[PDB]
Design an enzyme around this catalytic site. Structure first.
Site, PDB file in Angstrom:
ATOM      1  N   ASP A   1       0.855  -1.171   0.000  1.00 33.42           N
ATOM      2  CA  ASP A   1       0.000   0.000   0.000  1.00 33.42           C
ATOM      3  C   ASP A   1       0.900   1.232   0.000  1.00 33.42           C
ATOM      4  OD1 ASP A   1      -2.170   1.712   0.187  1.00 33.42           O
ATOM      5  OD2 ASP A   1      -2.440   1.411   2.350  1.00 33.42           O
TER       6      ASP A   1
ATOM      7  N   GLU B   1      -0.351  13.906   1.662  1.00 32.00           N
ATOM      8  CA  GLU B   1      -1.644  14.412   2.116  1.00 32.00           C
ATOM      9  C   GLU B   1      -2.789  13.583   1.534  1.00 32.00           C
ATOM     10  OE1 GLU B   1      -1.735  18.020   3.783  1.00 32.00           O
ATOM     11  OE2 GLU B   1      -3.775  17.367   4.291  1.00 32.00           O
ATOM     12  N   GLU B   2      -3.817  13.317   2.355  1.00 26.60           N
ATOM     13  CA  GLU B   2      -4.788  12.215   2.125  1.00 26.60           C
ATOM     14  C   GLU B   2      -4.996  11.828   0.669  1.00 26.60           C
ATOM     15  OE1 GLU B   2      -5.523  15.170   3.264  1.00 26.60           O
ATOM     16  OE2 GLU B   2      -5.928  14.934   5.414  1.00 26.60           O
TER      17      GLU B   2
ATOM     18  N   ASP C   1      -6.497   1.368  -4.835  1.00 29.80           N
ATOM     19  CA  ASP C   1      -6.143   1.304  -3.424  1.00 29.80           C
ATOM     20  C   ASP C   1      -5.921  -0.140  -2.992  1.00 29.80           C
ATOM     21  OD1 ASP C   1      -6.382   4.049  -3.317  1.00 29.80           O
ATOM     22  OD2 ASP C   1      -8.380   4.033  -2.405  1.00 29.80           O
TER      23      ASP C   1
END
Lengths: 306, 310
Positions: free
Chosen positions: B168, B197-198, B212
């Site tokens: 990941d 950042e997210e 993802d």
């Protein structure tokens, strides 16, 4: 440093949506830092220099504003205060949203006597905001519930004074940025930008808070152009007090104008608090004197290195 | 794709120090791209094709690590985590840095008593990292304070499955890169590799897709209904407030996946300025030095995207 004052004071940064502020601080500091990181709860940690002393320079990222709580039949917004804002600084004041939408603020007055009576007891449930939409269908897409807003007013220089929204506290953020951009560290220097909440990832030896204090220069004491406001704490360690006295001897040493306040979060590591005198706090037009802010920068440059 | 997943997962890229991963990605896609860019925050963006429809894919370039908050006298480094790292996945592990440096974590307490207890209610207050440093100065010159390190464990194959650190989201990076290498783009493709950042990447796009990692609950002593599993295909997530457009993209991906026997597996959960869908590769032991994926999930994934976009 004034390019910086605009870019920060004008940066949209209400609680929880401060990403732009962090950006300008970073690209502003890019080329003058060693590292940084965004901590679990949103604070940003900068470090520069190789030093045995670790010093934290804290500054609040966030600025006051409003949140939506109800979308109206015809598409008007109900709001509530975030941060210490009064419903009086909002009458006729226009508001930004993160998407860029501008809204205007008005009062729920019915008759000619209600517009003179809603004010002597004015809460936020008597305000409203226009966006330009006539339907809730057209208004919910423009602004969901839980949207935040800030002052639309920007940075203006009034005859040598710096007037803008949210000098609290990005005059402090700007000062820290300028320090990192001009200092050669004699210490390991962290600059932490904070998320205040419910009104320290790094371990350091000394914390120094850069905040503002209201100026008593208003007609009918902290004064503009009189220096940075050094805060004495009624209860602090021997080490916080030594921080204070050290900054004092350094200020008296280099002929640096400075002030001292006493007004009736501390890391446990010894911390001190220095403020910049700012008029009209919690108004769209907060006023600072630049000689104060470059005086503050100069002081920190001296105490923390060369 | 084993070579690519190897390079990506073995690349060192912790919270901002991704020049190696970015350089590897550009090194990889050279000869297939129509341009690229690094924004002011480090995000790598590429584009290929010039179709009417604009489609973006995005996957995170970042991996979990540690940051050194302190250096003591003997040369031991006190750390705090970067990302979601269990204090346990570190105990006994070696730590990899940028300048060629390797360390070893250790727990405080010499006696059997305080060790046996400290492992109960552990944290990084009770840890350190030795570099082979005997002086604090040579440690500061080897590992300055504020230095980041990642897992030293690397890539390996076990009976057909791929195991490495930081699957990941380097496996999503591999999916995007292979997609761009094996594509005849019918749409305008933009590839976005997420930094740090997210609400946009500077790219206007008709639709957006996220690649993802999803936790595969096929492990023993895991008993969830509709669990994610390896070699079940790419996991297509379903959102709670999914707009008409997001549901449109999702439904299209389902259509392709079933139309070409591409194995896939939905994923059900417990604003939205762009049409977006979320595809995920099932993965085992996320946040461990040894994340595991099945390759045919990745191949079925790249087939799904390549057939949905070309």
């Amino acid at each position: 440093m004034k390019e910086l004052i605009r870019k920060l004071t004008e940066a949209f940064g209400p609680s929880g949506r401060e990403e732009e502020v962090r950006s300008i601080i970073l690209e502003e500091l890019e080329g003058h830092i060693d590292g940084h990181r965004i901590d679990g709860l949103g604070n940003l940690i900068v470090w520069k220099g190789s030093g045995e002393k670790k010093v934290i320079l804290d500054a609040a990222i966030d600025e006051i504003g409003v949140v939506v709580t109800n979308v109206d039949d015809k598409g008007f917004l109900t709001i509530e205060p975030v941060g210490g804002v009064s419903p009086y600084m909002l009458l006729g004041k226009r508001i930004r949203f993160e998407n860029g939408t501008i809204g205007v603020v008005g009062m729920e007055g019915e008759t000619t006597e209600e517009r003179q009576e809603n004010v002597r007891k004015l809460s936020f449930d008597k305000l409203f905001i226009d966006i330009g939409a006539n339907s809730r269908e057209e208004a919910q897409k423009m602004c969901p519930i839980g949207s935040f807003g800030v002052y639309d007013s920007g940075f203006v220089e009034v005859s040598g004074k710096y007037v803008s929204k949210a000098m609290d506290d990005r005059i402090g953020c700007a000062v820290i940025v300028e320090v990192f951009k001009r200092i050669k560290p004699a210490v390991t220097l962290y600059g932490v930008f904070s998320v205040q909440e419910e009104v320290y990832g790094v371990p350091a030896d000394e914390a120094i808070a850069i905040d503002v204090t209201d100026s008593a220069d208003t007609p009918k004491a902290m004064r503009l152009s009189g220096g940075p406001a050094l805060k004495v704490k009624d209860r602090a360690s021997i080490s916080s007090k030594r921080i204070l006295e050290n900054l004092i001897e350094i200020a008296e040493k280099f002929d640096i104008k400075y002030q001292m306040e006493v007004l009736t979060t501390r890391e446990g590591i010894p911390s001190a608090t220095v403020s910049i005198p700012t008029r009209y706090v919690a108004s769209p037009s907060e006023m600072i004197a630049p000689d104060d802010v470059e005086a503050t920068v100069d002081l920190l440059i001296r105490y923390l290195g060369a």
